Ligand binder design. Structure first.
Ligand SMILES: O[C@@H]1[C@@H](O)[C@H](O[C@@H]2CO[C@@H](O[C@@H]3CO[C@@H](O[C@@H]4CO[C@@H](O)[C@H](O)[C@H]4O)[C@H](O)[C@H]3O)[C@H](O)[C@H]2O)OC[C@H]1O
Ligand SMILES: O[C@@H]1[C@@H](O)[C@H](O)OC[C@H]1O
Ligand SMILES: [Cl-]
Ligand SMILES: [Cl-]
Lengths: 132, 129
């Protein structure tokens, strides 16, 4: 029930081959090629077993997006990734597995992007009931 | 302390004589007259005793702003208001007094507003506990 919310200005870019800039309080992203993406580090890691849901809030979405919750590996696991999401300003991933969530990411799967842009507003971690 | 964060889309407008619209995940405001303002209700009431600091995050600020933390009266108390703020994207009020915090506000004090606009991004409650 407890929610840890990070707005865009609290998320630092760890890696990204997309184009990104923090402007007007949002991470504004532009993608030029298939699988271009950004990875952000969390200010503090959160144990995976404590998290019920991770909700990404976006704005000005002009391309379907893929969302990732990392738990310490070189990439997010398939169970912690959702692909081709469109039509909402908030998307929820219910993650599972071991270790701690250290990062999140946004990626595109479109093979020939054109005017492929989106803004990240915030990422929210809702903890399981009784997880403190 | 623990931080309870409300982004713009979680904040409901209670009252406002400023112009306001929720766009691109932000409350976008325009002020045509002195003391024009918006008051938003919070998703939940928070006891004042439990609150250390309330931090307002803004974007595209084009006019100095005044910030308010309500605690049950028809207006926010002077102790819970800060006036004429400029130059930052985050401003903090350390509130005081009785009761529960259930709303926040943004106001302009400029006497002849011109292209007076600002966006609200989020409001953060830093708790003692
Ligand atoms: O419809 C859904 C399909 O889109 C989907 O396919 C998965 C799409 O993601 C694939 O994984 C990508 C592969 O690219 C990685 O990027 C590389 C990072 O290193 C760079 O050197 C390289 O240039 C990039 O390509 C990216 O991290 C990773 O996420 C995955 O293998 C596909 O399975 O599958 C589900 C369908 O429903
Ligand atoms: O707080 C302000 C005070 O410091 C200044 O002197 O006059 C105007 C007030 O708003
Ligand atoms: Cl803007
Ligand atoms: Cl926009």
């Amino acid at each position: 029930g407890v929610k840890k919310v990070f707005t865009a200005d609290q998320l630092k870019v760890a890696w990204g081959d997309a184009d990104y800039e923090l402007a007007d309080g949002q991470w504004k992203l532009s993608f030029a090629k298939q699988y271009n993406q950004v990875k952000w580090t969390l200010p503090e890691s959160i144990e995976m077993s404590q998290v019920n849901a991770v909700t990404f809030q976006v704005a000005d979405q002009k391309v379907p997006i893929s969302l990732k919750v990392y738990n310490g590996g070189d990439d997010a696991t398939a169970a912690n990734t959702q692909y081709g999401l469109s039509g909402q300003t908030e998307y929820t991933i219910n993650p599972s597995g071991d270790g701690a969530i250290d990062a999140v990411g946004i990626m595109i799967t479109e093979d020939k992007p054109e005017n492929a842009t989106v803004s990240l507003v915030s990422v929210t971690f809702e903890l399981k009931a009784g997880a403190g």
